[PDB]
Amino acid sequence: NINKLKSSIESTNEAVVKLQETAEKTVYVLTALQDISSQISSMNQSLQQSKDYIKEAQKILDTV
Amino acid sequence: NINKLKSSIESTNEAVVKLQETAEKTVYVLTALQDSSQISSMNQSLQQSKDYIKEAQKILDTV
Amino acid sequence: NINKLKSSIESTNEAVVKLQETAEKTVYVLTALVDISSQISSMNQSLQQSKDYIKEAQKILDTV
Numbered sequence: 404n405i406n407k408l409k410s411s412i413e414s415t416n417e418a419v420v421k422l423q424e425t426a427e428k429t430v431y432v433l434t435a436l437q438d439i440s441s442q443i444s445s446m447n448q449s450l451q452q453s454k455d456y457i458k459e460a461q462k463i464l465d466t467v
Numbered sequence: 468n469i470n471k472l473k474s475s476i477e478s479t480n481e482a483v484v485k486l487q488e489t490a491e492k493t494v495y496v497l498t499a500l501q502d503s504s505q506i507s508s509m510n511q512s513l514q515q516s517k518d519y520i521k522e523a524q525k526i527l528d529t530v
Numbered sequence: 531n532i533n534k535l536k537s538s539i540e541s542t543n544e545a546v547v548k549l550q551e552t553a554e555k556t557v558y559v560l561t562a563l564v565d566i567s568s569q570i571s572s573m574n575q576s577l578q579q580s581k582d583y584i585k586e587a588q589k590i591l592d593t594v
Binding site: 405408409412413415416419420422423426427429430433434436437 | 531532535538539542545546549552553556559563566570573574577580581584587588591594
Binding site: 404405408411412415418419422425426429432436439440443446447450453454457460461464467 | 469472473476477479480483484486487490491493494497498500501
């Protein structure tokens with residue numbers, strides 16, 4: 404149960420890291436608008452991963 | 468405390484889902500731009516993220 | 531351990547708050563397309579802190 408929480412929290416954290424990775428690409432593209440398409444595809448990749456990680460976190464947490 | 472932690476985490480995770488939704492719309496607009504309501508939509512989802520995280524901290528304080 | 535879980539999640543929540551601050555600056559910039567540069571600069575600062583906070587979260591969590 405304690406282990407249950409830890410494993411779940413870990414997925415939440417990776418989900419957050421994925422959002423941070425996505426947010427840094429945002430800064431790059433916004434800067435630029437003053438390669439972008441490959442940055443956009445990249446954002447999509449890390450965003451889907453964030454979503455994948457959060458669903459896992461939620462799936463686990465439910466087990467508590 | 469275990470049940471309180473759980474209840475607190477659920478809000479955190481909801482907060483993250485909202486940011487992801489906010490990031491979805493961000494990607495849309497950026498994609499649109501390199502080829503107003505999307506914006507209104509970002510605000511709604513971001514504010515819910517705030518409410519969720521706020522709630523998470525409140526329950527967390529009871530632990 | 532519960533004291534530790536609370537400690538790590540605490541940091542996790544801080545990180546989320548910083549991502550929210552970064553998202554707020556993004557909406558502003560997207561709406562401007564104000565002070566894009568300044569705006570894009572706060573985004574970066576906000577994101578960095580978020581990053582610092584998640585790493586502290588991951589660190590504490592490992593103590594569980």
